[PDB]
Design a protein around this ligand. Structure first.
Ligand code: GCP
Ligand code: MET
Ligand code: MG
Ligand code: ZN
Lengths: 396, 77, 23
RNA sequence: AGCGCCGUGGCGCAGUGGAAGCGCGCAGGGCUCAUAACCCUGAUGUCCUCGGAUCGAAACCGAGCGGCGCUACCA
């Protein structure tokens, strides 16, 4: 299974899906007949193999020359997140999901790439600081150009929150210097404390509708969803509730029972948290058909998540705007403006009722559940689409 | 898709983003030729103008909506 | 510090030139 | 990955259940002093392949084949 969640960010027309494919080996489907060429909407998934040889892609090693094979060390999941301006809510959902980061920087293009820096700021928002700078293009640069880009990256990233960022050369086609990537992932990035102590919770980020067409309906599978666990282990034979629930505007909880837990190759009864798992339950597949189970907080029975509409939030904004090559100063919030307030994974633009310099009250059209902290991101409507302006946290 | 060709002369393949009768209106005056909108069932919609004026048809298709000029491969014929 | 990265970049160029002298 | 369409004469259709189907085409000839128009004759093939029923089959069906629309990547 998966122990720690890892994600990759990069600018548009930069190359991350094929990079992870050279890292993991699992094809990124990039489906729906329009996402194949411009951008994606749903999240990409992949699984890496970490068997380290201490005298790699396979559990048995033959390439190094010495017949010695590698032993089991780590098996880490990878959540490909699209770095484009159109979609940000799923980016922030995955950003709250991921624990390790891989940033791409393009040489011959403009060295400050607006989406790379924007998603680096997003990384620094949600307590992510173990980031490895990757030069996604290596063959397409000269040696002097590479040195200039190295110095430019160093001078640009000196005083940010992410200070200790090792640099790695990668490509999407060659498939070389890859063991360095795995080595640095194992070294710089430890698994966050995740054991039996904290109560179990779930965050579902995607909806899978499983109804095999053409086959007789007498035997079909239920509703499976992709979820991440920040605390505790899920075991088979438990009653679970999808808390954001169904709309009967008001919403009401969904109750169900676990049928299976796909864990990275198969169906495992137990699963240490820190990896994306396929929870297949008796839920109606139509509830898993469209973008429905995207950013929903899920509870194991025996806990009572609280449904909220009015939320008191401590929020902070940065000095300047992000995601633009013109730029303007950050302006203090005004009442009666719909601003998207993503609680870790949720996608709901709230109305601002109370305005303070460092505090706010916001009302969600769709009520959402709150358990402990559930870190938040804040986006406004300025550049004809959603633009990050700051970060938010629930305080009640 | 959206391929366009001209065959001695009918124009097969026409974007629908502008109304057809104004296309005919500009066509007849800027070519001085008999103009026909022939809608054959489920072929490329037929716009027929007389004479050998494929350069002038290029001028018109530039001046109406055309901004690509790269998927146009007029067969000589 | 980007010192141990230029070494891997040099190794990458060496491998690319060795395996694909055409490119 | 499924079900529904296409199955070529250079082309779109056309019947599909008596065997070479129309127009567009292209070549030649006719018309006229001449041209366009009009009037005739033509060479184009495996209507993708497998079988079944079938005196008779490209067709009627069925068990594979090349591309199109949806499901929507259907752990
Ligand atoms: N030569 C070369 N081409 C690359 C490299 N990385 C990406 N590309 C090019 O990117 C294109 C698609 O790569 P892909 O990773 O799937 O796109 P993407 O990262 O999902 C786009 P976005 O980041 O906005 O989501 C390919 O055509 C490829 O040639 C690279 O490192 N070297
Ligand atoms: C949504 S990806 C994580 C779940 C895993 N792929 C199973 O199946
Ligand atoms: Mg993808
Ligand atoms: Zn190639």
């Amino acid at each position: 299974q998966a122990t720690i969640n890892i994600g990759t960010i990069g600018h548009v027309a930069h190359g991350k899906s094929t990079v992870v494919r050279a890292i993991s080996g699992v094809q990124t489907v990039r489906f729906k007949d329009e996402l194949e060429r411009n951008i994606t909407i749903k999240l990409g998934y992949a699984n890496a193999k970490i068997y380290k040889c201490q005298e790699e892609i396979s559990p048995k090693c033959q390439r190094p020359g010495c017949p010695g094979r590698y032993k089991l060390v780590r098996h880490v999941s990878f959540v490909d997140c699209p770095g484009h301006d159109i979609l940000m809510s799923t980016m922030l959902s995955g950003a709250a999901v991921m624990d390790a980061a891989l940033l791409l920087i393009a040489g011959n293009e403009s060295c400050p790439q607006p989406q790379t820096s924007e998603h680096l700021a997003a990384i620094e928002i949600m307590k992510l600081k173990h980031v490895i700078i990757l030069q996604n293009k290596v063959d397409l640069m000269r040696e002097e150009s590479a040195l200039e880009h190295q110095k430019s990256i160093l001078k640009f990233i000196r005083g940010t929150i992410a200070d200790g960022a090792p640099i790695v050369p990668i490509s999407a086609q060659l498939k070389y210097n890859i063991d360095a990537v795995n080595e640095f992932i194992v070294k710089t990035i430890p698994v966050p404390p995740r054991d039996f102590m904290i109560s179990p919770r779930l965050i579902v980020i995607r909806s899978f509708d499983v109804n095999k067409p053409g086959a007789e309906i007498e035997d079909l599978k239920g509703g499976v969803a992709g979820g991440s666990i920040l605390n505790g282990v899920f075991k088979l034979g438990d009653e679970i509730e999808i808390r954001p629930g169904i709309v009967t505007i008001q919403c009401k909880p969904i109750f169900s029972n676990i049928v299976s837990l796909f864990a990275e190759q198969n169906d495992l009864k137990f699963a240490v948290p820190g990896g994306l798992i396929g929870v297949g339950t008796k839920v109606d597949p139509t509830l898993c058909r469209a973008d429905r189970l995207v950013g929903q907080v899920v509870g194991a029975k025996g806990h009572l998540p609280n449904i909220y509409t009015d939320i008191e939030i401590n929020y902070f904004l940065l000095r300047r705007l992000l995601g633009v090559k013109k730029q303007a100063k950050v302006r203090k919030l005004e009442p009666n403006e719909v601003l998207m307030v993503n609680i870790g994974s949720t996608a709901t633009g709230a109305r601002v009722v109370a305005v303070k310099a460092d505090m706010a009250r916001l009302q969600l059209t769709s009520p959402a559940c709150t358990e402990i902290n559930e870190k938040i991101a804040l986006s406004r409507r300025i550049e004809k689409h959603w633009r990050l302006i700051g970060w938010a946290t629930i305080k009640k | 898709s959206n391929y366009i060709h001209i065959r001695i002369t009918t124009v097969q393949g026409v974007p629908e983003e502008y109304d057809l009768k104004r296309i005919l209106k500009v066509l007849k005056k800027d070519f001085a030729c008999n103009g026909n909108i022939v809608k054959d069932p489920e072929m490329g919609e037929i716009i027929q103008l007389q004479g050998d004026q494929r350069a002038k048809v290029c001028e018109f298709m530039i001046s109406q909506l055309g901004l690509q000029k790269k998927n146009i491969k007029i067969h000589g014929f | 510090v980007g010192l141990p990265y230029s070494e891997l970049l040099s190794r990458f160029f060496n491998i690319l030139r060795t395996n694909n002298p055409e490119l």
